[PDB]
Amino acid sequence: GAESHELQDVLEETNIPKRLYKALSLLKKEFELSKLQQRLGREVEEKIKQTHRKYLLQEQLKIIKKELGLEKDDKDAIEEKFRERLKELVVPKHVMDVVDEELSKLGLLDNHSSEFNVTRNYLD
């Protein structure tokens, strides 16, 4: 696949040895180009195969998770902590519904805001 300039250079060569060496040189250069292209292509193909296998590993983790995992199990650490804290206490119904409403509002809000922290503080 050497350019027409290389073929012209080979033609310019008079001695059979010199022209044959230039032709073999161009063959080796073509080998270099083809091998470089193939190496880049194969490396990128391996990388994209790993990229797809990353979603595949996420899926495998998801099935293991289905067998035993965090999903299908709603969690609220502050909820449970305060519920156990008040469980032993003989607690009036008014404050119980107040705490339930406060926790419902806490869940209704983000976990990142000032009002969230103030609601947490009052609940504490």
Binding site: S114, N117, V118, N121
Partner: protein, 62 residues
């Protein structure tokens, strides 16, 4: 100009206990002693907790 703070430093170094001063004059914001609520971002604790953190001991000379 009598050396009260100087003798405080002298006692701190003689007793080997850490030293920390505290200016309460003309102060009105109690938060300097009792800190903030830790809720408002950037809220800082009382300056005594800061002294404990800096001196790194529970027997300083405040």
């Amino acid at each position: 100009g009598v050396g009260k703070t100087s003798i405080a430093r002298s006692i701190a170094r003689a007793l080997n206990r850490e030293y920390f001063r505290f200016s309460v004059g003309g102060m009105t914001d109690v938060a300097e002693i009792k800190g903030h609520r830790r809720t408002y971002v950037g809220a800082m604790p009382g300056k005594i907790i800061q002294c404990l953190k800096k001196t790194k001991t529970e027997n300083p000379l405040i």
